[PDB]
Amino acid sequence: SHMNSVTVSHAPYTITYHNDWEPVMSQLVEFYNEVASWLLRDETSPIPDKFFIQLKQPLRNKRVCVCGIDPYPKDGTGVPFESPNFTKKSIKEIASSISRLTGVIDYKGYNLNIIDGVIPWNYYLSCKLGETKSHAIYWDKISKLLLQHITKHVSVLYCLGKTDFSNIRAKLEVTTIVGYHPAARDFEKDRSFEIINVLLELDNKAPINWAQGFIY
Amino acid sequence: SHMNSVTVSHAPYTITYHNDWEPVMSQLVEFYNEVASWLLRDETSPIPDKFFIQLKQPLRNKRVCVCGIDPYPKDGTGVPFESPNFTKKSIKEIASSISRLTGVIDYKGYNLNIIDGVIPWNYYLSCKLGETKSHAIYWDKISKLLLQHITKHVSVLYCLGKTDFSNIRAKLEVTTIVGYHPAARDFEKDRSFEIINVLLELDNKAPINWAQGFIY
Ligand SMILES: [Cl-]
Ligand SMILES: [Cl-]
């Protein structure tokens, strides 16, 4: 069924997750306990209470995963790409791409987490405040475990960042696009890489309406 | 440089390979020796002398990998998908897709191994005469090793067969399309999946001219 379950750890001490994540929660508890103490030492983005909040998303209704390597170095919320005040460069560049693709001119913000069929994801679920990929060693196996579970549900995996994702062993056993980082210099590639996965969808599944992410 | 090197085994006893495959040849010798005796027991497709002939292809000039799970159950040549007399269903269906995409009406045959930028590949390099995926257990680690090496060179990995490739742990560390099997029942998906990877190319690399495969 569709429900939220619960599991015990140490800081945030309790992880609430949607039913769909069950197959993975036993190993995630094992992995997090042997790692948390090394991890919690630093000021993190997001705060420990927000590490796993994205596990409250169902995967049954997801067909696309938009994956960044890790949360914003500062002001991370626990929801990947989310910037509640729309000041973070990465989500502003995605918004502009979508704006250009769809034809939507006016908007106050953009959020990938409110689009039907889309789960936004952070490969590593944290980093030390102000330092990208700084907690990579701690999430290692957890990261592989959770992306393995996601790619069983979603049809398209869209990774943002070529060098960010350059050395990452991961899943075995679907359609992957390794596009540029949203804040890359030189546009056509960014914008076409988001239009290209609705036609990868067409081969079987329903399209994504990327404009559902716009906040007015 | 660009040259063909040589390595020692036991049946076919000698493996000739292009320079580009060097990083992988030490492990492939280790892996093949501990496996060959179990493998050579059966009548195979292709014959042992043809197992590794596709290692004579450079990878430096390859941007697309078209991957089947293993050679034809009968009449395999050592070159993936190749049917010298154009009677095998899989290559005839690919040819028809290309014919429909390109506009080429008349041809005697089709070969993926004569297209610039394309390396055709068999995940498992053999099978028992008349039985698909029958030598899967023997190639296991070798298969992972060689596809790992290919995907470092190519920009697009195109796998043909959803259930054929359903349970396959593989590479870590690029753009993957898991399309249908060429001999699938119900066409648009087959043909669009081959037109879709030239635009995945466009994001960075030169296009593939699929019509280069036609034999007149
Ligand atoms: Cl984030
Ligand atoms: Cl073959």
Coordinates of C-alpha atoms and ligand atoms in Angstrom, one line a residue:
Chain A
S1 CA 0.0 0.0 0.0
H2 CA 0.8 3.7 0.1
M3 CA 1.9 4.8 3.6
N4 CA 4.8 6.2 5.5
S5 CA 6.9 3.9 7.8
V6 CA 9.6 4.6 10.4
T7 CA 13.1 3.3 11.3
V8 CA 15.5 4.0 14.3
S9 CA 19.0 5.5 14.0
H10 CA 21.2 8.1 15.8
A11 CA 20.9 11.8 14.7
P12 CA 18.3 12.5 13.2
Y13 CA 17.6 9.4 15.4
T14 CA 14.4 8.6 13.3
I15 CA 14.0 8.2 9.6
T16 CA 10.5 8.5 8.1
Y17 CA 10.2 7.0 4.6
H18 CA 7.5 6.0 2.2
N19 CA 6.6 2.3 1.9
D20 CA 8.3 2.0 -1.5
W21 CA 11.7 2.4 0.1
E22 CA 11.2 -0.7 2.4
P23 CA 13.6 -3.1 0.5
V24 CA 16.5 -0.7 1.2
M25 CA 15.9 0.5 4.8
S26 CA 17.5 -2.4 6.7
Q27 CA 20.9 -1.9 4.8
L28 CA 20.6 2.0 5.1
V29 CA 20.4 1.7 8.9
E30 CA 23.4 -0.6 9.0
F31 CA 25.3 1.8 6.7
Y32 CA 24.3 5.0 8.4
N33 CA 25.2 3.8 12.0
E34 CA 28.8 2.9 11.0
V35 CA 29.2 6.3 9.4
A36 CA 27.0 8.9 11.2
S37 CA 29.6 9.7 13.9
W38 CA 32.3 10.7 11.3
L39 CA 29.6 12.6 9.3
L40 CA 27.9 14.6 12.1
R41 CA 31.2 16.1 13.2
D42 CA 30.8 18.9 10.6
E43 CA 28.3 21.7 10.0
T44 CA 26.3 20.2 7.2
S45 CA 24.0 21.1 4.2
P46 CA 21.3 20.2 4.8
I47 CA 20.9 19.9 8.6
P48 CA 20.8 16.2 9.9
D49 CA 17.0 16.4 10.4
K50 CA 16.7 17.0 6.6
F51 CA 19.1 14.3 5.4
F52 CA 16.5 11.8 4.4
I53 CA 13.3 13.8 4.0
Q54 CA 13.3 12.9 0.3
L55 CA 12.7 9.3 1.3
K56 CA 9.1 10.4 2.0
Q57 CA 8.5 10.4 -1.8
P58 CA 6.8 7.5 -3.4
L59 CA 8.7 5.8 -6.2
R60 CA 5.7 4.1 -7.8
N61 CA 4.6 7.3 -9.4
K62 CA 8.1 8.4 -10.6
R63 CA 9.4 7.8 -14.2
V64 CA 12.3 10.4 -14.3
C65 CA 15.1 11.0 -11.8
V66 CA 17.0 14.3 -12.0
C67 CA 20.2 13.7 -10.1
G68 CA 22.7 16.2 -8.7
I69 CA 25.9 14.9 -7.0
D70 CA 25.1 16.5 -3.6
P71 CA 23.2 19.3 -1.8
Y72 CA 24.0 23.0 -2.2
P73 CA 27.1 23.8 -0.1
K74 CA 24.9 26.3 1.8
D75 CA 21.2 26.6 2.6
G76 CA 20.3 23.0 1.5
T77 CA 16.7 22.0 2.6
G78 CA 16.8 18.2 2.2
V79 CA 14.8 18.5 -1.0
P80 CA 17.3 18.3 -4.0
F81 CA 17.6 21.5 -6.1
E82 CA 15.0 23.3 -3.9
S83 CA 15.7 27.0 -3.2
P84 CA 12.6 28.4 -1.4
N85 CA 13.7 32.0 -2.1
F86 CA 14.9 31.2 -5.7
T87 CA 18.5 32.5 -5.3
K88 CA 20.5 29.4 -6.0
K89 CA 22.2 29.4 -9.5
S90 CA 21.5 25.7 -10.4
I91 CA 17.7 25.8 -10.0
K92 CA 17.6 29.3 -11.7
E93 CA 19.4 27.9 -14.7
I94 CA 17.1 24.8 -14.9
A95 CA 14.1 27.2 -14.6
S96 CA 15.5 29.3 -17.5
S97 CA 15.9 26.1 -19.6
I98 CA 12.3 25.1 -18.9
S99 CA 11.1 28.7 -19.5
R100 CA 12.8 28.6 -22.9
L101 CA 11.5 25.1 -23.7
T102 CA 7.9 25.6 -22.6
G103 CA 7.4 29.2 -23.5
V104 CA 6.6 30.4 -19.9
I105 CA 7.9 34.0 -19.5
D106 CA 6.9 35.1 -16.0
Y107 CA 7.4 33.1 -12.7
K108 CA 8.7 33.7 -9.2
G109 CA 10.5 30.4 -8.8
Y110 CA 10.9 26.8 -9.8
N111 CA 10.9 23.4 -8.0
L112 CA 11.6 20.0 -9.5
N113 CA 9.9 18.3 -6.5
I114 CA 6.4 19.4 -7.5
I115 CA 6.4 17.8 -11.0
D116 CA 4.4 14.7 -11.6
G117 CA 6.7 11.8 -12.5
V118 CA 9.9 13.5 -11.4
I119 CA 12.0 12.7 -8.3
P120 CA 14.8 15.2 -7.9
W121 CA 17.8 13.5 -6.1
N122 CA 21.1 14.2 -4.4
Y123 CA 23.6 11.3 -4.9
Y124 CA 25.3 12.1 -1.7
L125 CA 22.7 13.3 0.8
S126 CA 25.0 15.9 2.5
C127 CA 28.3 17.9 2.5
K128 CA 30.2 20.1 4.9
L129 CA 28.9 23.7 4.9
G130 CA 30.6 25.4 2.0
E131 CA 32.3 22.4 0.4
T132 CA 31.1 20.4 -2.6
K133 CA 31.5 16.5 -2.5
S134 CA 33.1 16.9 1.0
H135 CA 31.1 14.0 2.5
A136 CA 31.5 11.7 -0.5
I137 CA 33.4 9.0 1.4
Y138 CA 30.6 8.6 4.1
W139 CA 27.6 8.2 1.7
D140 CA 29.5 6.0 -0.7
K141 CA 27.7 2.7 -0.3
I142 CA 24.4 4.3 0.9
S143 CA 24.4 6.4 -2.3
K144 CA 24.9 3.3 -4.5
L145 CA 22.2 1.5 -2.6
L146 CA 19.5 4.3 -3.0
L147 CA 20.3 5.1 -6.6
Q148 CA 20.1 1.3 -7.3
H149 CA 16.6 1.3 -5.8
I150 CA 15.5 4.5 -7.7
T151 CA 16.6 3.2 -11.2
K152 CA 14.4 0.1 -10.7
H153 CA 11.3 2.4 -10.7
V154 CA 12.3 5.2 -13.0
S155 CA 12.7 4.9 -16.8
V156 CA 15.1 7.8 -17.3
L157 CA 18.1 8.7 -15.1
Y158 CA 19.3 12.3 -15.9
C159 CA 22.6 13.2 -14.1
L160 CA 23.7 16.8 -14.1
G161 CA 27.5 17.2 -14.2
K162 CA 30.0 15.3 -16.3
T163 CA 33.0 15.7 -14.0
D164 CA 30.9 15.5 -10.9
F165 CA 29.6 12.1 -11.9
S166 CA 32.9 11.1 -13.7
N167 CA 34.1 8.5 -11.1
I168 CA 31.1 6.8 -9.6
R169 CA 30.6 3.1 -9.4
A170 CA 26.8 2.3 -9.0
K171 CA 23.8 0.2 -10.2
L172 CA 23.5 -3.1 -11.9
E173 CA 20.4 -4.5 -13.6
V174 CA 17.8 2.2 -16.9
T175 CA 18.1 4.8 -19.7
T176 CA 20.8 7.2 -18.5
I177 CA 21.6 10.8 -19.7
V178 CA 24.8 12.4 -18.3
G179 CA 24.2 16.0 -19.1
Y180 CA 26.1 19.2 -18.2
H181 CA 26.0 20.9 -14.9
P182 CA 23.2 23.5 -14.8
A183 CA 25.7 26.3 -14.1
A184 CA 27.9 25.4 -17.1
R185 CA 29.1 28.2 -19.4
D186 CA 28.1 27.7 -23.0
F187 CA 22.9 26.4 -23.3
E188 CA 21.6 24.5 -26.3
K189 CA 22.9 21.3 -24.7
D190 CA 21.3 22.1 -21.3
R191 CA 17.9 22.9 -22.9
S192 CA 17.8 20.1 -25.4
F193 CA 18.9 17.5 -22.7
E194 CA 15.7 18.3 -20.9
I195 CA 13.5 18.1 -24.0
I196 CA 15.2 14.8 -25.0
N197 CA 13.9 12.7 -22.1
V198 CA 10.1 13.2 -22.9
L199 CA 10.8 11.4 -26.2
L200 CA 12.8 8.7 -24.4
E201 CA 9.6 8.5 -22.3
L202 CA 7.4 8.3 -25.5
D203 CA 9.0 4.9 -26.3
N204 CA 6.7 3.6 -23.4
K205 CA 5.6 6.0 -20.7
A206 CA 3.7 9.3 -20.1
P207 CA 5.5 12.6 -20.7
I208 CA 6.8 15.0 -18.0
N209 CA 5.3 18.5 -17.9
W210 CA 8.4 20.4 -16.8
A211 CA 6.2 23.6 -16.4
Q212 CA 4.6 22.0 -13.4
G213 CA 7.7 23.1 -11.5
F214 CA 7.1 26.8 -12.0
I215 CA 6.0 28.9 -9.0
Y216 CA 4.0 32.1 -9.7
Chain B
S1 CA 50.0 4.3 -31.3
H2 CA 47.7 2.3 -33.6
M3 CA 48.8 -1.3 -33.9
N4 CA 47.7 -4.9 -33.1
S5 CA 49.3 -6.7 -30.2
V6 CA 49.2 -10.3 -29.0
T7 CA 48.6 -12.4 -25.9
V8 CA 48.8 -16.1 -24.9
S9 CA 46.0 -18.3 -23.7
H10 CA 44.6 -21.9 -24.3
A11 CA 42.1 -22.3 -27.3
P12 CA 42.1 -20.2 -29.4
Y13 CA 45.6 -20.2 -27.7
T14 CA 46.4 -16.7 -29.1
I15 CA 44.3 -13.5 -28.8
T16 CA 45.2 -10.7 -31.3
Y17 CA 43.8 -7.3 -30.1
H18 CA 44.2 -3.6 -31.0
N19 CA 46.4 -1.4 -28.8
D20 CA 43.4 0.3 -27.3
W21 CA 42.4 -2.9 -25.4
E22 CA 45.8 -3.1 -23.5
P23 CA 44.5 -1.9 -20.1
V24 CA 42.2 -4.9 -20.0
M25 CA 44.2 -7.8 -21.5
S26 CA 46.1 -8.9 -18.4
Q27 CA 42.8 -9.5 -16.5
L28 CA 41.1 -11.1 -19.5
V29 CA 43.9 -13.7 -19.7
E30 CA 43.5 -14.4 -16.0
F31 CA 39.7 -14.7 -16.4
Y32 CA 39.7 -16.8 -19.6
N33 CA 42.1 -19.4 -18.3
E34 CA 40.0 -20.2 -15.2
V35 CA 37.0 -20.5 -17.4
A36 CA 38.0 -21.8 -20.9
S37 CA 37.9 -25.5 -19.9
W38 CA 34.3 -25.3 -18.8
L39 CA 33.4 -23.2 -21.9
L40 CA 35.2 -25.2 -24.7
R41 CA 33.2 -28.4 -23.7
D42 CA 30.3 -27.4 -25.9
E43 CA 29.9 -26.7 -29.6
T44 CA 29.9 -22.9 -29.6
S45 CA 28.7 -19.9 -31.6
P46 CA 31.0 -18.6 -32.8
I47 CA 33.9 -21.0 -33.0
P48 CA 36.7 -20.5 -30.4
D49 CA 39.0 -18.9 -33.1
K50 CA 36.4 -16.2 -33.5
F51 CA 35.6 -15.4 -29.8
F52 CA 37.8 -12.3 -29.6
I53 CA 38.2 -11.1 -33.2
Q54 CA 36.2 -8.0 -32.3
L55 CA 39.1 -7.0 -30.0
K56 CA 40.9 -6.1 -33.3
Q57 CA 38.7 -3.0 -33.5
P58 CA 40.1 0.4 -32.3
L59 CA 38.1 2.1 -29.6
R60 CA 39.6 5.6 -30.2
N61 CA 37.4 6.1 -33.3
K62 CA 34.2 4.8 -31.7
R63 CA 31.4 6.9 -30.2
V64 CA 28.5 4.5 -30.3
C65 CA 28.2 0.9 -29.0
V66 CA 25.4 -1.3 -30.3
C67 CA 25.2 -4.2 -27.8
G68 CA 23.4 -7.5 -28.1
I69 CA 23.5 -9.9 -25.1
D70 CA 25.3 -12.7 -27.0
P71 CA 26.1 -14.1 -30.5
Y72 CA 23.5 -15.8 -32.7
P73 CA 22.7 -19.3 -31.4
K74 CA 23.9 -20.6 -34.8
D75 CA 26.2 -19.3 -37.5
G76 CA 27.9 -16.6 -35.4
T77 CA 31.0 -15.2 -37.0
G78 CA 32.8 -13.4 -34.2
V79 CA 31.6 -10.1 -35.4
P80 CA 28.4 -9.1 -33.5
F81 CA 25.1 -8.9 -35.6
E82 CA 27.0 -9.9 -38.8
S83 CA 25.2 -12.2 -41.2
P84 CA 27.3 -12.6 -44.3
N85 CA 24.4 -14.0 -46.3
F86 CA 21.8 -11.7 -44.7
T87 CA 19.4 -14.4 -43.3
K88 CA 19.5 -13.6 -39.6
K89 CA 16.3 -11.9 -38.3
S90 CA 18.0 -9.4 -35.9
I91 CA 20.2 -7.8 -38.6
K92 CA 17.4 -7.8 -41.1
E93 CA 15.2 -5.9 -38.7
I94 CA 17.9 -3.4 -37.9
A95 CA 18.5 -3.0 -41.7
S96 CA 14.7 -2.3 -42.2
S97 CA 14.8 0.3 -39.4
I98 CA 17.7 2.0 -41.0
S99 CA 16.1 1.7 -44.5
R100 CA 13.0 3.4 -43.1
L101 CA 15.0 6.1 -41.3
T102 CA 17.4 7.0 -44.1
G103 CA 15.3 6.4 -47.2
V104 CA 17.4 3.7 -48.7
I105 CA 15.1 1.2 -50.6
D106 CA 17.4 -1.3 -52.3
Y107 CA 20.2 -3.3 -50.6
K108 CA 21.6 -6.8 -50.4
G109 CA 22.6 -6.8 -46.8
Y110 CA 23.6 -4.7 -43.7
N111 CA 26.5 -4.7 -41.3
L112 CA 27.0 -2.6 -38.2
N113 CA 30.8 -3.3 -38.2
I114 CA 31.5 -1.1 -41.3
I115 CA 29.9 2.1 -39.9
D116 CA 32.3 4.8 -38.8
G117 CA 32.0 5.5 -35.1
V118 CA 30.0 2.3 -34.3
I119 CA 31.4 -0.7 -32.5
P120 CA 28.8 -3.6 -32.5
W121 CA 29.3 -5.8 -29.4
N122 CA 28.2 -9.1 -27.8
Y123 CA 28.0 -8.8 -24.1
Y124 CA 28.7 -12.5 -23.7
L125 CA 31.2 -13.5 -26.4
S126 CA 29.7 -17.0 -26.9
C127 CA 26.9 -19.5 -26.4
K128 CA 26.2 -23.2 -26.8
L129 CA 25.1 -24.0 -30.4
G130 CA 21.4 -23.4 -30.5
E131 CA 20.9 -21.9 -27.0
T132 CA 20.8 -18.1 -26.1
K133 CA 22.6 -16.9 -22.9
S134 CA 23.8 -20.5 -22.3
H135 CA 27.4 -19.4 -21.6
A136 CA 26.4 -16.4 -19.4
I137 CA 28.1 -17.9 -16.2
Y138 CA 31.5 -18.2 -17.9
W139 CA 31.8 -14.7 -19.5
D140 CA 30.3 -13.0 -16.4
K141 CA 33.4 -11.0 -15.2
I142 CA 35.1 -10.8 -18.6
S143 CA 31.8 -9.3 -19.9
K144 CA 31.7 -6.7 -17.2
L145 CA 35.4 -5.9 -17.7
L146 CA 35.2 -5.4 -21.5
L147 CA 32.0 -3.3 -21.4
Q148 CA 33.6 -1.2 -18.7
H149 CA 36.4 -0.5 -21.1
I150 CA 34.1 0.3 -24.1
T151 CA 31.9 2.8 -22.2
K152 CA 35.1 4.8 -21.4
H153 CA 35.6 5.4 -25.1
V154 CA 32.0 5.6 -26.5
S155 CA 29.5 8.4 -25.7
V156 CA 26.3 6.3 -26.3
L157 CA 25.7 2.7 -25.2
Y158 CA 22.7 1.3 -27.0
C159 CA 21.5 -2.1 -25.6
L160 CA 19.1 -4.2 -27.6
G161 CA 16.7 -6.3 -25.4
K162 CA 15.0 -5.3 -22.2
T163 CA 14.6 -8.7 -20.6
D164 CA 18.0 -9.9 -22.1
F165 CA 19.7 -7.0 -20.3
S166 CA 17.3 -7.0 -17.3
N167 CA 19.7 -8.6 -14.7
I168 CA 23.2 -7.4 -15.5
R169 CA 25.6 -5.8 -13.0
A170 CA 28.2 -3.9 -14.9
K171 CA 30.2 -0.6 -15.3
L172 CA 31.0 2.2 -12.8
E173 CA 32.3 5.6 -13.8
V174 CA 28.1 6.9 -20.3
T175 CA 24.7 7.7 -21.9
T176 CA 22.7 4.4 -22.1
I177 CA 19.7 3.5 -24.1
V178 CA 18.1 0.2 -23.3
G179 CA 15.9 -0.4 -26.4
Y180 CA 13.8 -3.3 -27.5
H181 CA 15.1 -6.5 -29.2
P182 CA 15.4 -6.1 -33.0
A183 CA 13.0 -9.1 -33.4
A184 CA 10.3 -7.6 -31.1
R185 CA 6.7 -7.6 -32.4
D186 CA 5.2 -4.1 -32.4
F187 CA 8.5 -0.7 -34.9
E188 CA 8.1 3.0 -34.1
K189 CA 10.2 2.4 -30.9
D190 CA 12.8 0.3 -32.8
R191 CA 13.2 3.0 -35.5
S192 CA 13.1 6.1 -33.3
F193 CA 15.6 4.5 -30.8
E194 CA 18.2 4.5 -33.6
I195 CA 17.4 8.1 -34.7
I196 CA 17.6 9.3 -31.1
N197 CA 21.3 8.6 -30.5
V198 CA 22.6 10.9 -33.3
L199 CA 20.9 13.8 -31.3
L200 CA 22.5 12.5 -28.1
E201 CA 25.7 12.7 -30.2
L202 CA 24.9 16.3 -31.3
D203 CA 25.3 17.5 -27.6
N204 CA 29.1 17.0 -28.3
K205 CA 30.2 14.5 -31.0
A206 CA 29.9 13.8 -34.7
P207 CA 26.8 12.0 -36.0
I208 CA 26.6 8.3 -37.1
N209 CA 25.7 7.6 -40.8
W210 CA 23.7 4.4 -40.3
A211 CA 23.4 4.0 -44.0
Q212 CA 27.2 3.2 -44.2
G213 CA 26.2 -0.3 -43.0
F214 CA 24.2 -1.1 -46.2
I215 CA 25.7 -3.7 -48.6
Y216 CA 24.7 -3.4 -52.3
Ligands
CL1 CL 20.2 20.4 -2.8
CL2 CL 26.5 -12.3 -33.2

